[PDB]
């Protein structure tokens, strides 16, 4: 159902 | 305005323009796709500040999303959109830098083995960068790219960069197995082998695409070992399983030998306690460089049908029943002969042995079938050797329902491996498989990790791709590349295992097979399960082996005949064409259109640099690199889907545009007699065996189910038109 | 459910025009000589054409002897015994009234705080929360159908773990609270450690001074008591990883699909109220609704406030064009201003908020159908621009309206609070980065109108607010509120036989639509709650949507709920209701 | 449970008693002085000796400064919304104090009866008595252990 | 999935 693996280097490039 | 994160850490504005610039240089060409439909899907995914690899992979992703049969050439944008990218991550550019520079840096980093540099000058390079043709980067299907990318290119493990594209890896790898070569020729193969692979005329294992150029010597992925009936060689084929799958190589152990459970005290050591102990053993010492025991590994394990414990190895991969009779983790091939086939026939019992009870039976079940009848009826009237009767149905029976059940027992005729073989007998006989039922080698059993007078067997393998070729005589010139090649690779790669070195110094034996099968019957208007298909296939299985074998007799005349010729069918001017089952006549009626009898003094004389040539191996990874059917399967479908970390990754059969109805899928198929035939007339030609499936579709039988008296017909089917091995067998669900 | 009927014997007393010639005629009532029957006759030509909608209970109720027509509450709960009683006795009366339920109880102290000189908040959030379930499900057929909340607490709350799974099937019964649904709150901050793969730290409300109030009202503030908490060593704190709490909060939305986002900064920034007098600390059972609140003493307790809203809907495929927007404008903000004054009120404090506010949530149904028939989609970014033209005339003539209504009735007690009386409107406060996804010009003379507001105030706190539709939507064979249909053939079962309805004019638009599954993912939609809400006042019930087998190995990726999560942030999204998942 | 005592270190900062002749002197310390502390003497001899016996809260509690000893309280609740809500909120009143509650509740009106011209008793009795466990639960570590009662 | 009964007749005629 669903899949709970986090990248969170992709994360932190995003821009509130 | 929206901004992009630039690869450093500067922003500047989006460009609109360049993305819709790349994306129709892609799609050049292609027909059926929609760049504007790409251009909306992953437009409204992007966010101010989004770095410039993320909107890269979007744009993929996109164009890799709507992959389908009414347009296929998605597979081909979303490939060179993916060839892009990685330009960039590999050059910081498109263009890729000069052959020397790339080399020189990649020696610097560690990349490549400095002996490229050492082995070809500068002056060499530049004319090896002539060669080179970057644009053969947009023949790839996106599932070759993402394979490519998986699997193949050098790279960095941790932190994810890429180091090189297709081109380099395909110029260095000829490059590379090639350099010995006198400085007459040596450019000539090396452009004419980079023309053959960057072309997909031929395909090779992925330890040789991802390794050779790179400082590693581990080439070798198929291994056959040997147990002999003791404590120190069960220690030594445990230790060689270690090794091997160490390097993540598949393995064939043959363990028949192993006295059962019960025979009396070895004056020390403890076979009382029977043969599963130590089957549980070689299961966790393939197991042991495995991530959690599971994933990578892998092993199939071989025994006679009339070994004493067969009914309790026979079941060994059954999931109820207590612990310790299950060895759930490895495959199995069940060995059999006419004489255990005629018992089903006429409705007899088996008498099942321990090899150690009866002197010279387990030697004659391979190299001679008289004496095999012999001495077995022999010694089912003495009765002061311990035996036990079954009913020969049962037998089958239970085998024929084990396979069915997993899928994973197979089967080998040891005396087509024997009767129609490179090998004489008497001197060199074939006991044992590998992983996936195609190779077919002489072994000794082992002393000790150490013993330098064992015999483990070693194959280097490789493809030719039907669907890349316009008639059969291109493979003249490709049988001697790739022969070369291949040969070259065997004193390039390391031997970890004295006794390995020895099967691969003495015998020098390949296995080379074909992908694309599929598809070159269907652009030939045949099909599998008619017959239609039976000339088409033995006039180019001759072909195969007539230049297979004739480029092997050339390389012997200018490098010499490999050490142990003399111990080949070859030697003594026997060739396939004499020995195959007869009633393949029955089947097919093309005429040889080569000449085999100049091809026979040519190798009485000078001999072979290869005690074998041809194997027909599974693909899967090599064929979706080509956009290849695999092997000699027919797809299941028309489309692929792959999962990844990525997004489903689709890929749809090479030309369905113009090919639907010419394709005939695995499950269009009646059923297996017209495959078989297929199979059989390849194996007329063929030095080992070949991995063939077998298929049964539930409901197309009363009732769901599959009959047993269909399980066996297709079995003697398999025997009586010489099918040396039977793999997988495949069930389809709902 | 709408004509008036004998429940027991089964007939039927009345038809549709009657209902809707009285609905209109009571609202009107006290409308001077000189007008009245021409805003009835222009009221029930519009409701009669379907260009507005109500709620059932305005529709059932509206002519006959009832008064009771609020069914939808906010409540907020204070950290004493006395809160907690009075906040149960107020759910239970508006339960019984078949209304919805907004429970604010994020401010009771967690399982293990000090002891309370007499109290007992020693025992923790949960058992209190149980007892407002059953205070919600006191007027429940068996227990079961019947009686709904949504309550609501912070993302660092000290118990947030153990909050997160009491809609979870396994586990101890001790250990749950399934028949409510729940609002996680979440600010910048919270959403900052997150990328920065930083803490989270947890704290009991009542151990961090000024915390509570600054997380709504001020978030410099929130962010230098935040950081100053977390150093000292004196206070009760805990330490998680923000990709493990919003992990288990997204898994639960996900296994759910009822676990809620509210981003409280978004809902106090851009606002009609000032945060310093009327923070919004809460929304309703939907999502949609965004009011002040006040604690309450006792069940009669004159210092609480209690907010109440009165709903409605346009119908965007029943008009033609925009400008109608004026006159149905004007319409629907008087008849549901006038039935503030007409509905009762069974809680003092309730009354209050809306005597104070007289606050008002009128939306849309029918959007889908309108995307369809303008040729533009939820998944592309085409209906980007139209939506922005939309949105801006909905609100322009709502607020029009009020204006106008405040000069002829007087501006409601405390406009004082809003930010509309510093002259402060919507298109002064929305996130800039709508900026970047539409470019749609302002077509309305928005300075005009704040002058008038301004100088003359208006009727009205609040007037948007984006709702679900299915009861009036099916009345006026209208796709539902802002969402895709999920196919273009509904069907219900009753015990009349099978009932079916096809999406409005199927036959010349099939291909115009984008049914829910045809999407390729949230952001397009998500962009299109971002544009509406730049104009609406309150909130939207947006969804998110995820088809398994759109993924490799058909599961959902929690990279790809969180990133969703982040959009709908960066775009000024204030609330997320439910999650859909397909299956098969 | 007697004895006064830091709940936090464990410290017991009394004895036996102490606590004896401390609840005598509470509890006449509104008499006269003429008998006062006869009364007293004679109050600490009988518990002191075990002729009379004293429940928990008393025990533990009087000398101290709390004035929380009602530990057996019995409501009855009226067949009306508010009624309903004033026996529940007193329930919580008192169990936070860990008293033991006796709930008639007998009178609310069955399942399925007339409607109220307001509220909502069409739906029974027993959504109502799942209002008062809750209620006598509220101050409960978990939802268990602790909190009593017994409806009538 | 599968029927276990063999006719040992009609196997008998196969030619190997």
């Known amino acids: ?16 | 305005n929206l901004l992009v994160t630039k690869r450093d850490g500067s922003t500047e504005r989006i460009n609109l323009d360049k993305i819709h610039r790349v994306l129709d240089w892609a799609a050049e060409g292609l027909h059926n796709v929609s760049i504007s439909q790409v251009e909306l899907r992953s437009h409204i995914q992007f966010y101010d500040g989004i770095k410039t690899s993320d909107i890269h992979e979007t744009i993929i992703k996109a164009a890799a999303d709507l992959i389908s049969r009414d347009a296929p050439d998605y597979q081909y944008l979303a490939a060179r959109l993916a060839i892009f990218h990685l330009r960039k991550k590999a050059y910081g550019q498109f263009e890729p830098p000069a052959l020397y520079d790339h080399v020189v840096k990649m020696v610097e980093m560690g990349k490549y083995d400095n002996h490229l540099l050492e082995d070809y000058t500068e002056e060499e390079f530049k004319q090896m960068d002539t060669f080179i043709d970057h644009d053969r980067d947009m023949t790839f299907s996106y599932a070759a790219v993402k394979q490519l990318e998986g699997k193949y290119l050098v790279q960095n493990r941790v932190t994810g960069e890429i180091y090189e594209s297709a081109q380099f890896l395909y110029i260095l790898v000829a490059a590379c197995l090639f350099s010995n070569y006198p400085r007459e020729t040596r450019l000539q193969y090396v452009k004419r082998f980079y023309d053959a692979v960057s072309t997909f005329k031929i395909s090779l294992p992925t330890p040789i695409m991802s390794g050779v150029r790179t400082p590693t010597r581990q080439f070798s992925s198929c291994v056959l070992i040997e147990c002999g009936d003791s404590l120190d060689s069960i220690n030594a084929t445990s230790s060689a399983i270690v090794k091997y799958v160490s390097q993540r190589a598949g393995i064939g152990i043959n363990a028949g030998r192993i006295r059962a459970l019960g025979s009396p005290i070895r004056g020390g050591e403890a076979f009382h306690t029977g043969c599963i102990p130590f089957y549980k053993h070689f299961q966790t010492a393939v197991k042991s460089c495995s991530q959690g025991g599971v994933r990578g590994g892998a092993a199939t394990l071989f025994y006679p049908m009339w070994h004493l414990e067969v009914e309790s190895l026979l079941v060994l991969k059954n999931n109820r029943g207590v612990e310790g009779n299950r060895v759930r983790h490895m495959d199995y091939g069940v060995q059999i002969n006419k004489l255990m086939y005629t018992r089903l026939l006429k409705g007899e019992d088996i008498t099942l042995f321990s090899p150690s009870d009866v002197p010279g039976l387990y030697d004659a079940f391979f190299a001679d079938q008289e004496e095999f009848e012999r001495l077995y009826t022999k010694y089912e009237k003495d009765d002061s050797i311990r035996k036990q009767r079954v009913k020969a149905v049962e037998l089958f029976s239970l085998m024929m329902q084990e396979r069915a059940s997993t899928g994973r027992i197979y089967i080998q005729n040891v005396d087509h491996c024997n009767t129609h073989s490179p090998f004489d007998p008497a001197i060199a006989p074939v006991r044992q498989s590998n992983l996936c039922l195609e190779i077919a080698l002489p072994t000794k059993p082992l002393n000790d990790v150490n013993d330098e007078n064992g015999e483990i067997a070693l194959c280097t393998l490789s493809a030719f791709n039907l669907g890349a070729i316009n008639n059969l005589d291109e493979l003249e010139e490709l049988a001697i590349l790739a022969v070369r090649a291949l040969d070259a690779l065997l004193d390039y790669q390391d031997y970890p295992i004295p006794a390995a070195k020895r099967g691969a110094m003495g015998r020098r034996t390949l296995g080379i097979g074909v992908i694309n099968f599929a598809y070159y019957l269907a652009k030939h208007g045949k099909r599998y399960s008619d017959g239609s298909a039976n000339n088409l296939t033995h006039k180019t299985f001759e072909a195969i082996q007539y230049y297979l074998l004739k480029a092997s007799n050339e390389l012997a005349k200018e490098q010499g005949a490999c050490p142990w010729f003399n111990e080949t069918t070859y030697a003594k001017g026997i060739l396939p064409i004499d020995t195959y089952k007869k009633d393949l006549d029955t089947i097919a009626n093309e005429p040889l259109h080569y000449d085999w009898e100049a091809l026979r003094e040519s190798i009485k004389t000078h001999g072979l640099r290869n005690s074998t040539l041809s194997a027909l191996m599974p693909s899967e990874t090599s064929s979706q690199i080509s956009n290849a059917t695999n092997g000699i399967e027919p797809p299941r479908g028309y489309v692929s889907i792959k999962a990844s970390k990525d997004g489903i990754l689709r890929q749809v059969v090479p030309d369905y545009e113009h090919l639907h109805d010419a394709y005939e899928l695995l499950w269009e198929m009646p059923g297996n007699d017209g495959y078989l035939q297929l199979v059989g007339i390849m194996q007329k030609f063929i030095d080992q065996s070949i991995s063939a499936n077998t298929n049964y579709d539930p409901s197309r039988f009363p009732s769901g189910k599959v009959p047993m008296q269909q399980l066996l017909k297709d079995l003697l089917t398999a025997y009586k038109f010489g099918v040396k091995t039977l793999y997988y067998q495949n069930t389809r669900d709902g």
Not at chain 1, 1 to 14: A, G, H, M, R, Y
């Open chain 1, 1 to 16: 159902q669903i899949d709970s693996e986090v990248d969170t280097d992709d994360l932190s490039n995003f821009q509130l």
